[PDB]
Design a protein around this ligand. Structure first.
Ligand SMILES: Nc1ccn([C@@H]2O[C@H](COP(=O)(O)OP(=O)(O)OP(=O)(O)O)[C@@H](O)[C@H]2O)c(=O)n1
Ligand SMILES: [Mg+2]
Ligand SMILES: [Mg+2]
Ligand SMILES: [Zn+2]
Lengths: 49, 49, 490, 383, 314
DNA sequence: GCTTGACAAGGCCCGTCCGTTATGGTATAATGGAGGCTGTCACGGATGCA
DNA sequence: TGCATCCGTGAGTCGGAGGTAATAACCATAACGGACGGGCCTTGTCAAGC
RNA sequence: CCGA
């Protein structure tokens, strides 16, 4: 539950329950400011660690 | 499969814990005693410090 | 390019049409897919209006029109006046997308049959009732005016509606069915009025009612902050994925290899065209009503197969892979292609014991090493003046020469090499080594790094990876070299 | 014995033909081929040798300016066919033993769309090798890691060297004690010449029946008039072993015997594999998988976690971009390594754009934005 | 009760309507003929009055327009009743065509379109019942929907009839000649070319999905073995080094012939030009241009100081 | 350093020509569908019912 | 309002090999379109001349 | 189906 209640919808969608996370993220209209290891791997950038 | 699923959940719950700053400036502390189950110890205090 | 954040929202019909529409210099938009044809059977060319169309998605070959007459490279940025295909490079079929204009409104299955089913939350109805209205099994009252037995958003059967037609009451009573009724119910919902009514209703209410009011209010407050309309959960325009992401290739033997997305789009287009044909010739309502329900079930199977009703299957009763099925699982896009990839400049072999060999050193086989370090050998063979290009270098590499082995010995000196054994349970499962060229076919491993890999010599194989950049070689040496990894991290 | 098969298919641009005249192939690469372009029985083939020469009529003829100028200078008439010959894979040397050819007008009938089918059988004798798997009948597997000369192997007090040294620590941890019973009984039968046969669960005939049988047969083998070094009553299963390099005996007596060892199908030639650059996948544009298609190793999620637990942000970035599904980065990295310059900075990987288009086709308005000097703008990742 | 079977829901919805009798069919056919001749005179009025016939009618030539609307409503209701009452015949016919490529509901809807055509083409002055002519048109629409849909790379109708004729001819010539089947006599009895017969047999194949598993497990997939058809990075770097060596070789000779050879083959413009348009880049005409490029090729074909480019010979 | 004239070669381009392809039709009477599950386990919401 | 029933969600990582699907009308008639053949022009070599 |  703490993995799915994070501020980033990309990490929560890549972890588990992609349909529900993407539905609540699309209705809430939220942004992903790319703060973490898992998002920069998907994007293709240098990880911030 | 149970072991690997637990490992993947533990990775996803804490993939954003990076050491960012040098000091936070807090006064709160954690009390450490020797772990004992009965009369004999399991981990001593010197190993826990 | 660089970007700072990624934002997700609900797509409006004008935005979906904005992704698909492209204008021509003659003054004509080309973005709509109207026929379910893919390619011609005689010549293997895409049809002029369909799921692979070159006017919508781009040319299949580099700098070549569909009908001919523009085969050269010199016509750049031009559109053929006879056919309509822009003379561009053929990699725009990865990016250019189209759309399908529906004849009836349809509901998105993510917003209806999910949990907590935001459509029934915003409509303040039960999920079974909205699911009965959408799939044409019950009516709903849109105008309850001049009646005591009828009220707003009340469901009726067909018998209850034909017995209401006894009274012809004596006023204008409207009903609705399908996603038109849901779109009309969502279009007349005043968001600020329902929000202030819910805020005036929470302070004086019961316990278990208050949680439902909080859930509806927090759903409604998202639609005012995002400035998105509630009727955008019903689709009028369907986006079409680019054709190179649903490829249709030919196997050696004449059979074509297709993807499962083409059958779903073909069903959507077929039922849409039949619905337009039935509405044109004024068919009876039991036939037009079954055609709208079938189009509704066709759009749902394209988005999420088997979410609501029967799973659409293929040839051997295998379920077709849908737009959420290609991303949602451990075989999807995230876990198979984004968080882990297959890489170049890599290999594997069985491992043997390496005594009379130091730590930080691995025994790398020679025929494995000419393949992994091939561009570094090719660079050295030209720098030494032996050959002059890549073709002579590749010819001398494959033909076998004693010069190549001295070149490879002086190339791999000081170039660290990462070794990996699966499963990688902790950090010490990937370590860097300085290779020495051994003769044979197995990789020689030092016996002290064997508990770090959990590796014995009874059948284990290890993968080998070569860093290319200079920052990647300085990181393998200063951070990952095996003579600095004595202590456990746990 | 390996088996290779090639089909002369029917293409729309023309029929594929099996011929001896192959473009860009030299003089002595055709000695083993017959008049039809097929190898003969009894020829030696190695990796890269032509088994069946085949051509197909390519017909696009879209040449770049470099090839056009190079064929303007040096003659160089470009032919209408291209090379499609059947070749030996990497390794797989051997002798050709069966070159049976099937043609539809000979009486055969083929898969549809194929003119003729050639089947080639290549046989090879494989000796024992470093990296091969070896096992006994008691679950004691192992990999050969060193092949020693017999003057370096340890030897017996009759001068006979040892064929194989097994580690004694693999016995009591794995708890397979019957291999020592088997080796001692086989060595008694070697010194007697009798070829014993013992059914399992032989402790029904008494207590310590296997031990008493083994040591009694070792005593009776040691009662031969010339072989009394075979059994020692002070230490039963062990005798004295000398070192082949120094001549000194080892300090403790060593269990010797005759074991029945096996050679398994897991040989190192079928396990070694390496890739520089090969084919790629259809949609994701990532390297393929498999030995048969020159595929790359999968750098899975646990390996990404292992690289993230280190520092190594640049190793992880080049593993995800310039080694997979970033085509401009692939070309730029190969050109920078060949010309000896610095590898440039990579771009957006190809599979992320595929995910963006898929999420847009699901009906989600997902986009990347960029902020710069009080301004928000939607970025174009397809470029 | 609640169910998710749309076929069961549709079968209940068509079971709610009763079946007709024969005098009902005669009266509905009379009203349908009245509707169709009214639509014929409406169509010729639209062809004459430029498609503004919504307020025009020849059935009268205030209460007369109400009677005309009532007549049109009863004739349209008669047509809809004759279509709706016979939907059980569509389900009884379309349950035979089940596994050819369409689902059951698509066959039902296309047979319903055929029933609409049969109801608008029926003649009650022949004595025959509606069910025979309806069965003909329903089977026509179902087979036409099979031949038009249910295949990704679709085949025309004459190809399907040629495949059926080839099946019948091969089975008859196999009944005649029991052993040694002969494609030469198959092409003889069909009077067609043998490579045309191979083309028909090649186009008659069915596609296979890229998501089919290869083994008896879920570890493999057909798309995992298909290589993308593109150009390798090795070919890209080889042609880029060839371009750089080519430009470095060409800039050693005279500056005029270098740009003549560059504009001739598109090494700077990306456009191969003719000999005259070089004469419009300059003003000296195209006869000197051919001699210039000839002597430039002769200078680049020298054996000395030109063998750096001779290694790219394949 | 170019220039004019002869000798052909080959893309555009507009006619027929025949093979392919789209479309319409057939009149005894026919009037509600085959076709598999039936041996996993555990947790969390969401109904639903007394 | 508490307890029973229901449904959706998850269930370790790499490598090799083999390998898929699998049955079902027919006929006239006009519209369509690729192929093939002359016309004119544009283009690419030989050849003599200042 | 097998190997780690
Ligand atoms: N389903 C499996 C089986 C094995 N392994 C890996 O393969 C190794 C198997 O070791 P192996 O040599 O097969 O057996 P040992 O544990 O060494 O025992 P023994 O010496 O008796 O064979 C394990 O450590 C484990 O990391 C795995 O990841 N998943
Ligand atoms: Mg092991
Ligand atoms: Mg082991
Ligand atoms: Zn064109």
């Amino acid at each position: 539950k703490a993995s799915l209640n994070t501020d980033s919808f990309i990490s929560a969608a890549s972890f588990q329950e992609t349909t529900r996370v993407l539905t609540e993220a699309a209705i809430e209209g939220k942004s992903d400011w790319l703060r973490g290891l898992k998002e920069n791997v998907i994007i293709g950038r240098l990880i911030p660690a | 499969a149970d072991s690997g699923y637990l490992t993947r959940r533990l990775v996803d719950v804490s993939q954003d814990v990076i050491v960012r700053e040098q000091d936070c400036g807090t006064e709160r502390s954690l009390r450490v005693t020797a772990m004992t189950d009965g009369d004999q110890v399991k981990i001593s205090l010197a190993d826990r410090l | 390019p660089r970007f700072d954040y990624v934002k997700i929202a609900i797509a409006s019909p004008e935005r979906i049409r904005q992704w698909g529409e492209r204008t021509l210099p003659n003054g004509t938009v080309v973005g709509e897919v109207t026929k379910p044809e893919t390619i011609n059977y005689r010549t293997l060319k895409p049809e002029m209006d369909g799921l692979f169309c070159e006017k919508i998605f781009g040319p299949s070959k580099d700098w070549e029109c569909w009908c001919g007459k523009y085969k050269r490279v010199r016509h750049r940025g031009i559109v053929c006046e006879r056919c309509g295909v822009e003379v561009t490079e053929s990699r725009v079929r990865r990016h250019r997308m189209g759309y399908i204009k529906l004849a009836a409104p349809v509901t998105h299955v993510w917003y209806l049959k999910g949990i907590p089913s935001y459509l029934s939350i915003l409509l303040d109805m039960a999920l079974r009732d909205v699911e009965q209205i959408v799939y044409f099994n019950a009516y709903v009252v849109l105008n309850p005016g001049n009646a005591s037995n009828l009220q707003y958003k009340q469901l009726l059967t067909e018998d209850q509606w034909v017995e209401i037609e006894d009274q012809i009451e004596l006023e204008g009573i409207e009903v609705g069915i399908g996603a038109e009724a849901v779109q009309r119910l969502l279009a007349e919902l005043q968001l600020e009025e329902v929000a202030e009514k819910l805020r005036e209703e929470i302070l004086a209410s019961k316990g278990q009612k208050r949680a439902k009011l909080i859930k509806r209010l927090r759903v409604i407050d998202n639609f005012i902050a995002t400035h998105s309309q509630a009727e955008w959960m019903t689709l009028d325009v369907i986006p079409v994925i680019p054709p190179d992401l649903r490829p249709m290739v030919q196997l050696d033997g004449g059979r074509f290899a297709t993807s499962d997305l083409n059958d779903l789009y073909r069903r959507v287009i077929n039922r849409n065209n039949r619905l337009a044909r039935l509405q044109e010739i004024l068919a009876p309502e039991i036939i037009v009503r079954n055609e709208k329900r079938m189009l509704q079930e066709a759009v749902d199977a394209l988005i999420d197969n088997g979410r609501r009703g029967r799973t659409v299957v293929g040839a051997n009763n295998r379920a077709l892979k849908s737009l959420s099925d290609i991303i949602e699982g451990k075989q999807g896009r995230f876990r198979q292609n984004l968080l882990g990839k297959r890489v170049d400049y890599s290999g594997r072999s069985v491992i043997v014991v390496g005594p009379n060999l130091k730590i930080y050193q691995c025994g790398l086989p020679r025929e494995m090493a000419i393949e992994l370090f091939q561009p570094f050998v090719i660079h050295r063979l030209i720098k030494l003046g032996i050959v002059n290009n890549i073709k002579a270098a590749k010819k001398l590499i494959l033909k076998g020469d004693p010069q190549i082995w001295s070149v490879l010995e002086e190339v791999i000196t000081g170039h660290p090499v990462m070794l990996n054994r699966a499963p990688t349970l902790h950090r010490l499962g990937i370590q860097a080594f300085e290779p020495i060229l051994v003769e044979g076919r197995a990789i020689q491993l030092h016996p002290l790094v064997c508990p770090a890999f959990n590796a014995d010599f009874d059948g284990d194989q290890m993968a080998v990876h070569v860093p290319l950049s200079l920052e990647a070689q300085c990181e393998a040496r200063l951070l990952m070299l095996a003579c600095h990894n004595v202590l456990s991290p746990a | 014995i390996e088996k290779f098969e090639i089909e002369a298919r029917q293409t729309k641009l023309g029929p594929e033909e099996i011929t001896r005249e192959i473009p860009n192939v030299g003089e002595d690469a055709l000695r083993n081929l017959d008049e039809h372009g097929i190898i003969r029985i009894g020829a030696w083939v190695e990796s890269g040798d032509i088994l069946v020469g085949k051509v197909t009529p390519k017909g696009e003829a879209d040449q770049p300016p470099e090839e056009k100028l190079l064929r303007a200078i040096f003659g160089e008439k470009a032919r209408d066919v291209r090379d499609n010959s059947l070749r030996v894979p990497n390794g797989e040397k051997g002798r050709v033993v069966d070159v049976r050819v099937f043609t539809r007008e000979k009486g055969d009938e083929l898969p549809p769309g194929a003119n003729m089918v050639v089947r080639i059988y290549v046989a090879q004798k494989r000796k024992i090798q470093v990296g091969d798997k070896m096992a006994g009948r008691h679950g004691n597997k192992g990999i050969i890691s060193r092949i020693l000369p017999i003057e370096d192997m340890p030897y017996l007090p009759d001068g006979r060297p040892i064929d194989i040294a097994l580690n004694p620590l693999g016995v009591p941890s794995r708890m397979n004690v019957g291999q020592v019973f088997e080796c001692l009984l086989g060595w008694a039968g070697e010194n007697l010449g009798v070829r014993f046969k013992i059914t399992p669960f032989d402790e029904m005939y008494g207590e310590e029946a296997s031990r008493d049988t083994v040591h009694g047969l070792l005593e009776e083998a040691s009662q031969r008039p010339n072989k009394d070094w075979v059994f020692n009553e002070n230490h039963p299963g062990k005798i004295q072993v000398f070192d082949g390099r120094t001549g000194e005996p080892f300090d403790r007596p060593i269990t010797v015997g005759q074991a029945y060892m096996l050679k398994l199908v897991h040989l190192v030639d079928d396990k070694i594999h390496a890739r520089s650059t090969g084919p790629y996948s259809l949609v994701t544009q990532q390297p393929l998988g498999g030995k048969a298609q020159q595929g790359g190793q999968r750098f899975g999620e646990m390996e990404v976690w292992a690289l993230e637990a280190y520092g190594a942000a640049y190793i992880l970035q080049e593993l995800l971009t310039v080694k997979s599904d970033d085509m401009q980065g692939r070309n730029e990295a190969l050109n920078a390594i060949v010309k000896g310059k610095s590898i440039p900075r990579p771009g957006t990987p190809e599979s992320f754009k595929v995910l963006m288009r898929e999420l847009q086709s699901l009906g989600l308005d997902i986009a990347a934005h960029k902020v710069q000097l009080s301004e928000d703008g939607e970025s174009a990742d397809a470029e | 009760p609640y169910t998710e079977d749309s076929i069961r829901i549709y079968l209940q919805e068509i079971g709610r309507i009763r079946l007709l009798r024969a005098e009902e069919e005669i009266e509905l056919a009379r009203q349908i003929a009245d509707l169709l001749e009214l639509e014929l005179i409406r169509d010729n009025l639209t062809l004459q009055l430029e498609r503004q016939p919504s307020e025009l009618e020849w059935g009268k030539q205030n209460k007369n327009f109400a009677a005309f609307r009532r007549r049109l409503f009863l004739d349209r209701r008669a047509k809809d009743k004759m279509v709706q009452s016979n939907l059980r015949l569509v389900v009884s016919i379309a349950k035979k065509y089940m596994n050819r490529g369409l689902s059951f509901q698509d066959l039902i809807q296309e047979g319903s379109l055929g029933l609409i055509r049969a109801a608008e083409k029926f003649d009650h002055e022949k004595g025959y019942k509606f069910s025979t002519y309806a069965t003909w048109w329903i089977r026509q629409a179902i087979t036409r929907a099979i031949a038009d849909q249910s295949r990704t790379i679709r085949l025309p109708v004459h190809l399907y009839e040629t495949i059926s004729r080839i099946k019948k001819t091969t089975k008859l010539l196999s009944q005649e000649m029991r052993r040694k089947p002969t494609e030469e006599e198959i092409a003889e009895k069909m009077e067609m070319t043998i490579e045309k017969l191979r083309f028909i047999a090649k186009s008659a194949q069915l596609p296979i999905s890229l998501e089919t598993p290869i083994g008896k497990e879920e570890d493999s997939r057909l798309g995992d073995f298909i290589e993308a058809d593109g150009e390798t990075p090795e070919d890209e770097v080889s042609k880029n080094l060839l371009r750089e060596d080519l430009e470095n070789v060409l800039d050693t000779l005279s500056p005029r012939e270098r740009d003549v050879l560059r504009l001739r083959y598109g090494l700077d413009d990306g456009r191969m030009k003719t000999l005259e348009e070089i004469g419009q880049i300059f003003n000296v005409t195209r006869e000197r241009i051919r001699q210039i490029e000839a002597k430039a090729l002769r200078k680049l074909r020298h054996p000395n100081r030109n063998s750096i480019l001779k290694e790219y010979i394949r």
